[PDB]
Amino acid sequence: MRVGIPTETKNNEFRVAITPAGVAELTRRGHEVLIQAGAGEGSAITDADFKAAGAQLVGTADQVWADADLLLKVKEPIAAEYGRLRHGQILFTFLHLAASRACTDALLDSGTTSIAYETVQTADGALPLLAPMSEVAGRLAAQVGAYHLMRTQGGRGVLMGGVPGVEPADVVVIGAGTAGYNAARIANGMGATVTVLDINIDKLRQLDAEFCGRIHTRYSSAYELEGAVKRADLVIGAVLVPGAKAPKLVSNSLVAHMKPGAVLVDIAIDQGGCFEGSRPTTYDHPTFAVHDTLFYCVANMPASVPKTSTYALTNATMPYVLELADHGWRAACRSNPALAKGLSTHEGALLSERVATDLGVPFTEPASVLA
Amino acid sequence: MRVGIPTETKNNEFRVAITPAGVAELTRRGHEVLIQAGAGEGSAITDADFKAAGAQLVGTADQVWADADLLLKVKEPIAAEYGRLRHGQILFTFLHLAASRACTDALLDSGTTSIAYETVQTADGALPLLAPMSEVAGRLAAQVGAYHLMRTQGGRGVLMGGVPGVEPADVVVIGAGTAGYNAARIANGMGATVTVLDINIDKLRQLDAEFCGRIHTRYSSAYELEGAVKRADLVIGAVLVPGAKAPKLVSNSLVAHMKPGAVLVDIAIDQGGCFEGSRPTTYDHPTFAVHDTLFYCVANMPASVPKTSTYALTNATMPYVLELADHGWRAACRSNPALAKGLSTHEGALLSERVATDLGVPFTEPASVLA
Amino acid sequence: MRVGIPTETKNNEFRVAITPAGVAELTRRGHEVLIQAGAGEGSAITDADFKAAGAQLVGTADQVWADADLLLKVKEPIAAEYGRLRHGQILFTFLHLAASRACTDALLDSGTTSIAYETVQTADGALPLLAPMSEVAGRLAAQVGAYHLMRTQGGRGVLMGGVPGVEPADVVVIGAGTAGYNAARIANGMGATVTVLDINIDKLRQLDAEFCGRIHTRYSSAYELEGAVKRADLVIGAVLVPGAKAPKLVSNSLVAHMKPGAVLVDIAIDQGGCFEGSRPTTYDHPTFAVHDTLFYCVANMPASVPKTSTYALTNATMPYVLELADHGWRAACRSNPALAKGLSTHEGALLSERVATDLGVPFTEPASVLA
Amino acid sequence: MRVGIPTETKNNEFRVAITPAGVAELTRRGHEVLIQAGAGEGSAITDADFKAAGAQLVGTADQVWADADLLLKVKEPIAAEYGRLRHGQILFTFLHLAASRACTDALLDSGTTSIAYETVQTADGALPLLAPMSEVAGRLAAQVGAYHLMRTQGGRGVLMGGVPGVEPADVVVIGAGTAGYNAARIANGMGATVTVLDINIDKLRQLDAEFCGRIHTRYSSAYELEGAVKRADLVIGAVLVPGAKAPKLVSNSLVAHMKPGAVLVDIAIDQGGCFEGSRPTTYDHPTFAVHDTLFYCVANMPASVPKTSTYALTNATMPYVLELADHGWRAACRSNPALAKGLSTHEGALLSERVATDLGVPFTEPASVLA
Amino acid sequence: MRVGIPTETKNNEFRVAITPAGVAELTRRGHEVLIQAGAGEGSAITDADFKAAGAQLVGTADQVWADADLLLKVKEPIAAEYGRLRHGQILFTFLHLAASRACTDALLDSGTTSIAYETVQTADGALPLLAPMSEVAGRLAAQVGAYHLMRTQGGRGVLMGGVPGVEPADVVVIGAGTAGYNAARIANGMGATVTVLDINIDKLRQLDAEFCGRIHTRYSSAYELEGAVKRADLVIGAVLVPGAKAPKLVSNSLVAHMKPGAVLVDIAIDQGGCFEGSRPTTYDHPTFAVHDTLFYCVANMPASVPKTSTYALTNATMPYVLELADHGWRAACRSNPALAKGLSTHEGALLSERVATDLGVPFTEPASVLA
């Protein structure tokens, strides 16, 4: 079986769906790896690095998409790529079909068999392909917040960690999951005083243990949330609902009461955001004002640290990549129920319940497509 | 005696030379404090805050400059201000007279008696009024470095701390003084692996103790420095030679050998920089390319976190301010040798030898202006 | 030469001026050590422990006082002991002659040559026999503060460290010398959020490095001190000026604005206190109300942990004791300038300037008593 | 539906069963919250604070008890209160029906439907409403032990953390559950050397990892326990068996071999104690002697830090309170099996097996009262 | 001026007196560096590494010795090398002339001008060239002790850190200087419980601060030392008397009371040892019994980690090496009093007081040889 990786075509997407390490593993199992020349450049992986590990470099996208039995991507197929989708081809990538009827149509139209990173789910309910992205975004949030708190960028102009004799920044992190833990850890390391809000006290218990006294924790009643946000220099919204909408926890009237220059970072912005004033922004125009505060809501944040996030994602996808390549999609899916939860599309059929219901019509077919 | 504080007029200087804390102290001792309406805004100190503490708010610059016996500033007098300099007036601020013959001429012409923050020196050779700006700079450097490391900003695209399974950034800090210690500490807090280089082993011993194994230390031979810089994702230049010009420790050919996308932050940029390719940049155009790497050389960096730096500076100046207001300049200088080392100008006389020699002519008069 | 240690007679003084370790040292050098039977009991040192180390147990106080050439105590001679003072006898203890007209007269009268622990001072200005007592007091202050913050004792009823989800206590420590450092450390260890205030930024810099972010530091302007105190659940006064009287840093009006039930602990109570409402209390009636707040001002605090303080004090005194035993007082004092600073009394003469120049007349006689 | 909270009547019970945060939640869901004036005083919550959050302040206890559909308390109804129990009313508090036949009678007699905090149990066997009381207790134990270790209180007179050069206290904690973990953590924070004993090595592994070497762990054989206890200055009994009686792990003959002045704190006192010599004490007479050691056995310890323990408890109860208020008891109990395990009384029937079987007769009625 | 480095000839001396780093610095200032082929192999530095940095490789010892103006070594000249000593040549190495009249004779005879690493001393009394060897020795002592504590090696058979539920090893370190601090640090990191003894309480204070509670400190009376030693699984003797003979602090009768299998490591073995039973051993026969305990007394311990210790040493020597190379010996010595302290020999004259008045006759000549 033949495996192909095209350059990501979306604007400001710098990741690639495989690294030399992954190339090496597939090659040693006798699969052939076709990589579009230039595909790893945004992530600082050169064509030489890919060649060294056994890949065949190929000049054009067209030639990757025709030719590959398994196609690995990072983002969903873009308009210009709809034409390339094929019949006897397994496509594995972030799909988010619910957010694009156009995309879903193109997939079932071409009769492509597709599997979504975001709905691969282990028996304990974990989504192992999203987890690494949440780690990245959590850690990033602390960094971008710190920078945008400079007066020079419109922020209140406080240094994260103060200096001896002077108060550090007061940071609140809403949500104690993977993203929230990671944002808290990095803000803390920068010397800010950090309080995390959650309604799950066991999650707060973990945070309390891990840092002894250092990271403060507070039970997240609306009343305690208001009080904390009112005093914050930096607020990080990190309530990521696995596959739903993400609740709006901070209202515009509450922001109207924050200190002038405070900054709010919405890690939940893909999938809806969790401040009410939230709206997706771009790399060149990352922030905008809401009543005297600064909002930072860049969509698709993990893409800004591609050397890190390419490895983070492909380390997690690798085992699943290997199973597909060795066994083909049915079989791999029969052997591995986590994988099967990821099945989305096969020869015109829509296999996802949340998507079928949600995206107007088509209608499910459970998985019985696994005869 | 009357004490006046004007808005800083240099662009992108957001600090102010007093806080309410200081205002209250001066009032309690029966001095009158004159503050230019709006002076504290960049530092998020309102007129009301200043009023509350006992200050008299004044509508124009001219009114503060005439009226004040002791005039407190952050930066040196700008061209537009030369007109306001007076005869029986003590001016206390960062002067950097060596950098400007125009400024020095305006000072001795007007016969004003001036004391420089940056040459106030205690018996042990410390410069207590620069130290807090070095703390700010060092901590800032790590944050700006981390941010500009994003692909989105032209950097290699690596997250400071990595995420589990993925390597963190390799950060090297050149110089183990106040600035370098602080850079190292914040970068280490963000999860990066950090190596600091210095020729003073005792300073390396302190860093080793403070962090147990965590912060690596290396003796700074040219050979060792080249080796460490060649591997770095992030390099911080923190060699601040206290009143001289700062050695050029990273050469352009050495930068030609660094990883593509590496970022170099030069905290030594005021006073000359310590990379060969260094050149002062501005807040809106902070970086530029040198051979495939990105240089960050923003002058006057402490000014971008004005809420923090105003307090860090004014807490350090306050005891000198109080001694001046209570006793007048001679006497304060006779009592306090550290303050005396700051004496620059009095009634046309230039009192600083480093300056007099350096600045072509005028010629010293030691201090016997203290009859 | 013969060394004697009487039981401490002042009430609730539980320490003893030597341990078996010290007795053994003295014995090995061929001195005779006379100990009043029962002397070590408050400090959980039994007569058998003393005997095992070479001491001679002796039934009565009188027999220790006559017979000993060098007399070691912890506190000053009490009224009932004035009769026991002798002429060819060195007395070494905490004296505080300043505080007792009567005591000074007694010592002069009897012609006793006496050396005070608290004015023994090294070339660098350290007071090495007081330091261990400040360590003890600092650590104790946090313990007592925690306890009296219980509602059951009259305090506002907050646990030092909170529990997950709930705020810890807000603790401010005024003073960053040895006592303040130690109080802050233990408070922090208990999980409280701790801020220390001081006017010496270098001491704030040490505290900041030692705990990375963990212990907050604030420059001690009255303005800043008032803000910190108003928010505090526990305030610990730890400004011990070397040998003067201790400034009053918290006013009664200030206390009237504090949270009801807040507790204030004045470690500076011996030697004056540093709150205005402060007044010496005793172990059985340790606290008293001041406007809805609770003050804790127990005098002589190190005595409440005698097993620790006995050792702390006597480890510090030991080398001075050995010098005096081996060489007699002059010679010991000529050899050792730190010891000579402790000289207080000899053959009717008063040898201390601060005390002569404070306790009305007698008049100094510098030290020339060392012919 | 209408929710009522009476002042706590039991002597030295300072908590209150709701906070403003909880009142706010209930109010926004359109429920009526009746609070007896003064109810929050012990916990430093004013009637103003309650009224701001939407509460109806009510002058008498009887006014709350009639009028309230759901009645929230902290402790069991006392003698004086039995008259107030009603038919169509849900009572939610700490019951301990096992320990009072009288109580139980009153409950079934008045036909009140009551649910007990301490039997609410999640599928995994956790008792989430007891947990926060354990955390408080464990943390408290370390503070009270420290205090009573002073000679002034009868203890042997050692400071928890020692001071440089002098040994710290030897603390042993029996039991590695939530209370044990929290006592050990605070004791260690105060600088003492801490050993914890348990028969569950997994729990010892967690302590080991959490503090790296810092907290010592020892397997709890009687032999090993004997050895540890004999050397300890402070012993904390923290073995809280779920809802049974708590084993007697330290016998009186063993205490006879302990160091004079050692202090033993029994957190397991409510529910029986775990020292043989243990006996409930009160806040004004907290300790008593057992062979030259000091026992501390204050019942109801969490009440002494009411500001902390009120929030800790009510954060944990809140989501149950909301389910009851919104759904009524049947339905809430159908919906939520953890709640159901708490069911103790309804219209004369006794619903708890452990109490039916243990409190002589009445006899169970499983839960079928949920028709 | 030309600089030569011979292979070290002493058995089991693996270090070399320069690294590539050093070669490069020298070369850049226009000095030619002669290195004997093979010199760096013991320290894992190849001839290629040295060549790449500018060195001239030379086949024979004789050729380096004749030809070099400045000769750099690690150890003192051995018998077989006496013949190679020259007239107009500066020799810079560890000499320890007091330990060998033969060696001293050879140096004076040949008229060589020699400077000892061990007596280079800075104004503050530091010996900067021994310090790094003390760091190495202290760190090594913990490793070797841990190893020989296995039964397999004759030790008591305890693991340094224990495992959960099982006691770790009890380690005592005598001496709180650079070596003892480093031994303490590593032992602690291995999980052992560590007590350090010293007479200097300030040194104990530093250790207490640095590790919070973690590393125990005890005042070093004989009485206290005995108690500590009796209980120890491992004792490390770390009292390095700067240039004297090192006190014998552990007696053979004391070792007779230690636990069977205990191991004692004497870092002070070069220079005399600090245990009574101590006796220099060799790498292949490293240990020996003294009453049921194991002594470990390998001479010249830093030589066993030559990759580490070459760098540690040559980093410290480098600035001195550059001053000599650039200025010649007189002048370097006149500019640099620390260097002048090292002067030992010139043209038949013996220039060291301690050595002359210790090594029978010759007689000093202060330094007047600097005309």
Side-chain angles (χ1 to χ4, degrees), chain D residues 233-284:
Chain D
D233 303 292
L234 211 203
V235 168
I236 289 133
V239 175
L240 283 79
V241 173
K245 220 171 78 182
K248 303 280 177 286
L249 299 155
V250 186
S251 76
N252 290 341
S253 41
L254 198 283
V255 2
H257 303 259
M258 295 192 220
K259 297 189 294 190
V263 354
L264 304 263
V265 170
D266 200 331
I267 284 163
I269 189 56
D270 311 285
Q271 104 181 30
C274 64
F275 310 139
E276 176 185 37
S278 283
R279 172 229 299 180
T281 55
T282 71
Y283 300 107
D284 35 82

Side-chain angles (χ1 to χ4, degrees), chain E residues 158-240 242-353 355-356 358:
Chain E
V158 351
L159 187 62
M160 289 290 265
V163 283
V166 167
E167 229 158 19
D170 189 288
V171 184
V172 6
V173 179
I174 310 156
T178 300
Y181 157 79
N182 277 100
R185 173 151 152 192
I186 304 311
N188 186 62
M190 328 218 210
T193 141
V194 183
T195 312
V196 4
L197 284 97
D198 207 78
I199 39 83
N200 186 148
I201 286 154
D202 275 309
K203 237 114 111 176
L204 303 179
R205 227 154 309 209
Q206 281 182 78
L207 273 57
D208 174 70
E210 212 185 304
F211 303 85
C212 264
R214 195 41 156 126
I215 288 181
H216 304 303
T217 55
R218 220 112 87 156
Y219 194 76
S220 196
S221 52
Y223 175 96
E224 212 63 11
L225 166 339
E226 267 180 55
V229 165
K230 270 154 88 106
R231 285 274 278 275
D233 294 304
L234 205 220
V235 171
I236 299 151
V239 174
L240 261 64
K245 228 211 176 146
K248 295 200 165 38
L249 291 165
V250 180
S251 75
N252 287 356
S253 75
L254 209 223
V255 352
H257 295 282
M258 296 185 213
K259 317 181 199 141
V263 14
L264 297 268
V265 186
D266 199 332
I267 281 172
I269 191 61
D270 306 333
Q271 128 187 0
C274 62
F275 309 136
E276 199 195 353
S278 278
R279 201 251 264 173
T281 51
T282 47
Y283 301 109
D284 41 337
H285 293 279
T287 63
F288 65 89
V290 173
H291 313 304
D292 289 335
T293 76
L294 225 34
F295 273 43
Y296 180 107
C297 302
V298 184
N300 202 227
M301 244 181 265
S304 60
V305 274
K307 183 156 188 55
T308 298
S309 67
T310 291
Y311 281 73
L313 184 61
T314 64
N315 287 347
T317 75
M318 195 180 293
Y320 296 111
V321 173
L322 310 181
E323 232 171 295
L324 286 164
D326 285 350
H327 299 304
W329 67 269
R330 164 203 308 97
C333 281
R334 309 178 53 74
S335 283
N336 207 344
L339 246 186
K341 295 296 167 70
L343 248 185
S344 297
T345 293
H346 190 231
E347 317 244 59
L350 186 72
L351 315 167
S352 166
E353 174 98 66
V355 158
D358 187 7

Side-chain angles (χ1 to χ4, degrees), chain C residues 139 147-148 151 157 159 161-162, chain D residues 139 147-148 162 304-305 307-308:
Chain C
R139 299 189 175 202
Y147 191 78
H148 293 274
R151 237 243 109 239
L159 188 63
Chain D
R139 282 179 195 207
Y147 191 87
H148 290 273
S304 55
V305 283
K307 174 94 136 64
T308 307

Side-chain angles (χ1 to χ4, degrees), chain E residues 93-100 102-107:
Chain E
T93 193
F94 283 118
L95 290 167
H96 295 126
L97 281 191
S100 169
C103 187
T104 308
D105 266 359
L107 292 200

Side-chain angles (χ1 to χ4, degrees), chain B residues 36-61:
Chain B
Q36 212 187 127
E41 250 149 28
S43 287
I45 303 166
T46 55
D47 296 309
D49 285 331
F50 277 137
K51 259 249 81 155
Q56 245 215 114
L57 268 253
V58 156
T60 51

Side-chain angles (χ1 to χ4, degrees), chain A residues 29 33 73 113 116 141 148 174 176 178 282 312 331:
Chain A
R29 297 166 144 67
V33 198
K73 277 177 90 337
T113 138
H148 283 292
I174 307 179
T178 296
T282 57

Side-chain angles (χ1 to χ4, degrees), chain A residues 107-127:
Chain A
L107 284 178
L108 44 78
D109 231 316
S110 68
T112 196
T113 138
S114 74
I115 307 177
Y117 288 164
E118 70 268 22
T119 85
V120 164
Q121 212 190 252
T122 47
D124 68 306
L127 298 164

